[PDB]
Design an enzyme around this catalytic site. Sequence first.
Site, PDB file in Angstrom:
ATOM      1  CD  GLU A  89     -39.747  31.355 -70.419  1.00 17.91           C
ATOM      2  OE1 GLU A  89     -39.568  32.106 -71.396  1.00 17.91           O
ATOM      3  OE2 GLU A  89     -39.599  30.115 -70.463  1.00 17.91           O
ATOM      4  CG  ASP A 105     -40.560  29.799 -65.998  1.00 19.41           C
ATOM      5  OD1 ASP A 105     -40.165  29.944 -67.174  1.00 19.41           O
ATOM      6  OD2 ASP A 105     -41.157  28.770 -65.607  1.00 19.41           O
ATOM      7  CE  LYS A 125     -41.697  23.013 -64.072  1.00 19.36           C
ATOM      8  NZ  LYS A 125     -40.811  23.110 -65.275  1.00 19.36           N
TER       9      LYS A 125
END
Lengths: 180, 180, 180, 180
Positions: free
Chosen positions: B65, B93, B119
């Site tokens: 990220e 991430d 997700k």
Amino acid sequence: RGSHMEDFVRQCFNPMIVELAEKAMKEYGEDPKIETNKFAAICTHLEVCFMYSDGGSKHRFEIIEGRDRIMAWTVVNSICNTTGVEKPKFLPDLYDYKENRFIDIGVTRREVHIYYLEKANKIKSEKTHIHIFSFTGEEMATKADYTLDEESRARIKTRLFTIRQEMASRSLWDSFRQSE
Amino acid sequence: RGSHMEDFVRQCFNPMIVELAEKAMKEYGEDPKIETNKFAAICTHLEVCFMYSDGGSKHRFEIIEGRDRIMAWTVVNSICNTTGVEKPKFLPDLYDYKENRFIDIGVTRREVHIYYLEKANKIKSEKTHIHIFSFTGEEMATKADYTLDEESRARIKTRLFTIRQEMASRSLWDSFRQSE
Amino acid sequence: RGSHMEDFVRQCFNPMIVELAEKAMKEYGEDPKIETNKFAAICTHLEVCFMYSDGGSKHRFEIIEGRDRIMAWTVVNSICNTTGVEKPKFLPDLYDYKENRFIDIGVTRREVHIYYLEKANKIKSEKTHIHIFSFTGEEMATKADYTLDEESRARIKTRLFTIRQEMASRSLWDSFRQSE
Amino acid sequence: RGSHMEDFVRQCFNPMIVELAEKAMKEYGEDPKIETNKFAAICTHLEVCFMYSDGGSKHRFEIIEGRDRIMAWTVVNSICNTTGVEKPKFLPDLYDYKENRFIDIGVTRREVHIYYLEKANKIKSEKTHIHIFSFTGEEMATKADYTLDEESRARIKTRLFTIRQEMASRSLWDSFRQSE
Ligand SMILES: O=C1c2c(O)c(=O)ccn2N([C@@H]2c3ccccc3SCc3c2ccc(F)c3F)[C@@H]2COCCN12
Ligand SMILES: O=C1c2c(O)c(=O)ccn2N([C@@H]2c3ccccc3SCc3c2ccc(F)c3F)[C@@H]2COCCN12
Ligand SMILES: O=C1c2c(O)c(=O)ccn2N([C@@H]2c3ccccc3SCc3c2ccc(F)c3F)[C@@H]2COCCN12
Ligand SMILES: O=C1c2c(O)c(=O)ccn2N([C@@H]2c3ccccc3SCc3c2ccc(F)c3F)[C@@H]2COCCN12
Ligand SMILES: [Mn+2]
Ligand SMILES: [Mn+2]
Ligand SMILES: [Mn+2]
Ligand SMILES: [Mn+2]
Ligand SMILES: [Mn+2]
Ligand SMILES: [Mn+2]
Ligand SMILES: [Mn+2]
Ligand SMILES: [Mn+2]
């Protein structure tokens, strides 16, 4: 003589590391604007060595790389005279106070096996620990003793592959690889 | 078009995090001055990810990220080619060098259960570890494996609840929650 | 009165350490531009003490060195009144909260044995732990208890030998050694 | 109205701590130039709390002190709503994520016993852990559970005794002590 590789090196590496590499080449009379593949190799080796010495516990490593030749040998001398290790024939990269040995780090564009062979047969300082990394994620260490825990070595391999990709993205990878 | 939520975001979050969130939205063509709830969500997710990666031991996590899309995928590529993990279908991430898996972090204004379901059924990258946090202190992680020790996760949950309160104090909480 | 040793000291040591040594000599009325061997010894002892206190775990040591005499004795007083240790007759260098004792560090140009003898027979504060280092890599500690782990002491010995070499390289070593 | 105690406080404490103490007194309408003993007490309590929170492992403590009242209660609220602890009647100083409890720290010029009695009978928040320190090196903690390891508490006691000495050296100690 403005090379794409020179500009790439300057944007890819920390400015301190670029400075230390430039000073290294000047200490050996080489010019970063002409030996640009060598410029890139020296910067890469420097970043790997600094990441390596960051892998240990605090105070674990003495960094020999990134010093001028006279002072590098000075610190080697002090290490040898206070610990009793044999003085290497050629300049190592680090000293390990935990395991009490010098580390000669290598970074190669080929099979780690053959680069390790070359270095071992060259230095033959025995006591000096060898640790090869490759731009494809392979490593090779004396006695299968890799000094650092897995994650610290994984970081180094990831960074090496990212450098490789950045070079490839700019079409410098081929000449770099076929320069070693 | 000056939103109370924009000014709130700028005073609530570190300036580096606001900058990285603005750059993220620009990388996807979105505008922080119009998608202000999205602006706030992206800043929050960023702060959570940075706190998360701070939870580990040194060198434990690779932060994906907060990079531009090209470089984020570059680092994913290097991780995959040096470790042998399967390349995720969607951008994760973090990467965990200790447990050797990608972490996709989520932050939701609803029941962690249903966001995790969404997700998991979306990415279905299996190997990729999911970790949901909620603005009410709930979390949900793949295989009930929460990666970090209790205190590091507790900090994150406290901060999420403080953000929620700050928004509520300014009467932005309702629109934020009813925007997800 | 410009000494090569003064200029050497100023280039060899961190500017903060040079400043603290100058302030020490001024607190005792000595002049760094005349007592230049003493200047060098004080700088060396200071660097050794700071490296030493860095060896421990966080919060382990209270640094008495590098303070003005009044404040050094103030902190000694507080240590004694909160812990119950006996107040040393002479100013120690550190206090060890882990082992609960004062450390008097020494650095000598001769056999550690004879310098340790001198200090022990001088202070005779018993409770006060003595730790001698030499410019040749020897050390000597009360009860063969060396307080720190091997690597932290090895660093100190390496640095002492490097200072010795730098002095020798400039031909100051002889007068320094024959000054103690 | 220029007090020796005001100037003493400003030279004895870190400027950040002086600033936070001034802001605390202003949040409660008090004036550091008139309530100078209170000024000194607040600065001392602040330094003790910060040293305390430094004693733990990383992420161990949430610092409630040194925030404005509204935000201090905000963070208390978030801690309570994510952990499930009961909300204290009065503002605590820290929260311990390791042991999961609020810490109310106290610093007294008298017997720790009687100050602890006063605070316990005042708050009676039960769950809230009390930890008294004295300017003579005594401490008193709920259930004889002192949270931190010995050395971290020893540092705090040493600093308290040094403050006491500095005040005495300037002849402020008597009025300070007879002000509590
Ligand atoms: O330390 C090294 C060194 C290594 O440690 C190494 O691993 C590989 C290669 N090295 N060499 C480095 C170097 C380091 C890293 C990458 C490439 C090169 S290529 C030759 C060269 C070096 C330095 C300056 C210079 F101008 C050079 F031509 C020289 C060998 O002489 C001791 C210092 N040194
Ligand atoms: O990484 C993420 C991402 C997450 O990691 C996530 O957890 C939730 C949501 N994401 N998305 C983030 C994002 C991140 C955090 C909070 C909200 C959003 S909302 C869509 C969006 C994102 C970034 C820029 C942008 F303009 C967006 F519209 C996108 C999905 O494409 C890969 C990058 N990314
Ligand atoms: O702390 C020390 C001290 C030591 O700790 C020590 O180990 C050896 C010697 N010391 N002495 C140091 C000192 C420290 C290091 C190297 C040489 C000297 S030589 C005399 C001297 C010192 C300080 C200022 C000065 F002007 C001096 F002449 C004095 C003894 O009075 C307490 C402070 N102190
Ligand atoms: O947090 C405290 C606090 C403590 O935590 C404490 O331990 C002792 C005493 N406190 N009080 C502190 C305080 C803190 C430290 C030393 C003395 C004082 S004396 C009154 C006072 C305080 C803050 C500002 C002010 F103007 C005051 F008059 C107030 C009680 O209301 C919650 C905040 N607070
Ligand atoms: Mn080398
Ligand atoms: Mn090498
Ligand atoms: Mn993401
Ligand atoms: Mn995410
Ligand atoms: Mn001393
Ligand atoms: Mn000494
Ligand atoms: Mn308080
Ligand atoms: Mn308190």
